[PDB]
Each structure stands twice: as structure tokens, then as C-alpha cells.
């Protein structure tokens, strides 16, 4: 199984070949022909009366390639919802242009006995490989005095009168899910370091790595000749720092910043490096 070490204290002897592991499968470069720039939302129901199969109720895509016959007019993100049972057409509705502002709330025009169960609002990003989901509980009651809604500490719990409409809230306004976005820049990795006992925001740049293969090194020649990252880092998502040879002056805090702003990816691997001998 895969694990993520986000911060660690490591000791290397002076003169050794130190390796500071920085890796991520989401920082792997792929060709444009494989990019599936598509966001999908779908509501699923794990019914309590059925108690077995969890069926999909309705989904909505963000992007598509408009055609007229065999002529490909182009691709532009628009949007359209699709119910999976022809009977729910007109009964289950999502907000129009849901991906414009991140409002994916499910509207049920008139709840039925078979609508009872645990709902899930699921977001899929095929380009950024993101999966987000929230749960909503729905109970159908015949007593209107019991109809209402409350937050039980983790999810919305609905109690709807039979035949009455319901709204299952699902809102995610993060830029990766909405149509708004800054122009996508290539993936970039930043290595920096600071002496022991110094806050992170006062670190000195050590090395920049861009997905196109371009790199930028900092520091005096004595430091640059001992610090490197193996070639084709973005081909395998490995940006591990190589310090060879490691010196007692290299003792300090090292940071590996992984950036893919278009996908909301901003992670940091921290290394408190100690040098013995
Ligand atoms: Cl076609
Ligand atoms: Cl019913
Ligand atoms: Cl590279």
C-alpha cells in the first residue's frame, strides 16, 4: 500500500549521499492527447428499502465536443443533466449551470417511498483525478409535524412529507470544480531550505523544476555542485533531492513544494536534516 510522509527528521553522516524522498503520482506529466478535461457530478442512492444495490439517480457533465453530423465544431464546457430512470425525468433536478458556481444541490419535486435512503453527491475530475463526496440522509414521513432538517454533526438529515418536495444541499465552490480558473501553468516543484530554528517563510530557494524539463538552481557553486535531482523527474513523479556529499553546514529544514495550481494541488514535504560526525 502507498503512504505519504509529509514531514520527517532524518540524520545522515557527513560525506554521505543523502536522499530526501519527494514523490507524488499527481505530479506526473502526460501528453495532451490523454487529457480528459471533464468534470462530472452524480447523485447516488443506497436505498434502505432495497438494502442492497446503490443506484445512480442523475449525473451532469461539464464539457463536451459539439458536432453536427461528421463535422466536429469544437469542444466547450456547457452542461446538461441526465436521469437514469425515464420515470425520474422532471422529478429530479440539478441547478442550471451547476458547474458555474459549484451548486450541485439535488431537487426532488415530489418524494416517494422509494426515495428513502442515504444519498451521496459525488464529484469527479477526470483531468485532475479528484474525487469528492458528501452524504445526505432522507426520511419520508406521513406526519407533517415531523418534516424538517438538521445537521447531525457530519451530514444533513432530511425528513420530508410524502409527496412534498425536497432539497439535498451539495455546494463546492473551490475553483477546481467551478468554471472559473486562472490560465493553467505547467506543474512546478520548488526545493528550499533554511537553518535550524527559522520559520518556513524565510527559507532560501534551492531548486526549481518545471514539467517541461526546465530547471533553475540557486546558491553558490559549492552548494549547486552537491545538490541535484535525477533527470525526467516529471515522467515518474519523483523529485527526490540528492545531496552528495552532505556537509555539516547542510543541517537545517528542507522543503519540497509540489504545485499544480489549476488542480488545487499545493503540498509540501518537510525534512529536518541532521548531519552527524
Ligand atoms: Cl460522430
Ligand atoms: Cl410513496
Ligand atoms: Cl524533469
Curated annotation (Swiss-Prot):
Sugar-bearing residues? 103
- Name recorded for this polypeptide: Matrix remodeling-associated protein 8
- Stated role: Transmembrane protein which can modulate activity of various signaling pathways, probably via binding to integrin ITGAV:ITGB3. Mediates heterophilic cell-cell interactions in vitro. Inhibits osteoclastogenesis downstream of TNFSF11/RANKL and CSF1, where it may function by attenuating signaling via integrin ITGB3 and MAP kinase p38. Plays a role in cartilage formation where it promotes proliferation and maturation of growth plate chondrocytes. Stimulates formation of primary cilia in chondrocytes.
Is this entry keyworded Aminoacyl-tRNA synthetase?
A: no
Q: Which GO terms describe its biological process?
A: cell adhesion; cell differentiation
State the UniProt keywords alphabetically: Cell adhesion, Cell junction, Cell membrane, Cell projection, Cytoplasm, Disulfide bond, Glycoprotein, Immunoglobulin domain, Membrane, Nucleus, Phosphoprotein, Repeat, Signal, Tight junction, Transmembrane, Transmembrane helix
User: Residues bearing Phosphoserine?
Assistant: 212
Q: Which residues are exposed on the Extracellular face of the membrane?
A: 1-277
Give the residue ranges of motif RGD. 236-238
State any GO CC term. Answer: nucleus
Disulphide connectivity of cysteines? 22-121, 170-256
Subcellular location(s): the record lists: Cell membrane; Cell junction, Tight junction; Cytoplasm; Cell projection, Cilium membrane
Q: Which domain of life is it from?
A: Eukaryota
**Subunit organization:** Homodimer in cis. Does not appear to form trans-homodimers. Interacts with ITGB3; the interaction inhibits ITGAV:ITGB3 heterodimer formation.
Q: Which residues form the Ig-like V-type domain?
A: 1-141, 144-276
How does the UniProt record describe the way this protein sits in the membrane?
Single-pass type I membrane protein
Ranked from the top, the taxonomy reads: Eukaryota, Metazoa, Chordata, Craniata, Vertebrata
What's the entry's take on its domains?
Answer: The RGD motif is involved in integrin ITGAV:ITGB3 binding.
Amino acid at each position: 500500500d502507498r503512504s505519504v510522509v509529509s514531514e520527517s527528521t532524518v540524520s545522515w553522516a557527513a560525506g554521505a549521499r543523502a536522499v530526501l524522498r519527494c514523490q507524488s503520482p499527481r505530479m506526473v506529466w502526460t501528453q495532451d492527447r490523454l487529457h480528459d478535461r471533464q468534470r462530472v457530478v452524480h447523485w447516488d442512492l443506497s436505498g434502505s428499502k432495497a438494502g442492497g444495490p446503490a443506484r445512480r439517480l442523475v449525473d451532469m457533465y461539464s464539457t463536451g465536443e459539439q458536432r453536427v453530423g461528421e463535422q466536429r465544431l469544437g469542444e466547450q464546457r456547457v452542461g446538461e443533466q441526465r436521469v437514469y430512470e425515464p420515470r425520474d425525468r422532471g422529478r429530479l433536478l440539478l441547478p442550471p449551470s451547476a458547474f458555474h458556481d459549484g451548486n450541485f444541490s439535488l431537487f426532488i419535486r415530489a418524494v416517494e417511498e422509494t426515495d428513502e435512503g442515504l444519498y451521496t453527491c459525488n464529484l469527479h475530475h477526470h483531468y485532475c483525478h479528484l474525487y469528492e463526496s458528501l452524504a445526505v440522509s432522507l426520511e419520508v414521513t406521513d406526519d407533517p409535524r415531523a418534516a424538517g432538517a438538521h445537521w447531525d454533526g457530519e451530514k444533513e438529515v432530511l425528513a420530508v412529507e410524502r409527496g412534498a418536495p425536497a432539497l439535498l444541499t451539495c455546494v463546492n465552490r473551490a475553483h477546481v470544480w467551478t468554471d472559473r480558473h486562472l490560465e493553467e501553468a505547467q506543474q512546478v516543484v520548488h526545493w528550499d531550505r533554511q537553518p535550524p530554528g527559522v520559520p518556513h517563510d524565510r527559507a532560501d530557494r534551492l531548486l526549481d523544476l518545471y514539467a517541461s524539463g526546465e530547471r533553475r538552481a540557486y546558491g553558490p557553486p559549492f552548494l549547486r555542485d552537491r545538490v541535484a535531482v535525477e533527470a525526467d523527474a516529471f515522467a515518474r513523479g519523483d523529485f527526490s533531492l540528492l545531496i552528495d556529499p552532505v556537509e555539516p553546514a547542510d543541517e537545517g529544514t528542507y522543503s519540497c513544494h509540489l504545485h499544480h495550481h489549476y488542480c488545487g494541488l499545493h503540498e509540501r514535504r518537510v525534512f529536518h536534516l541532521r548531519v552527524t560526525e
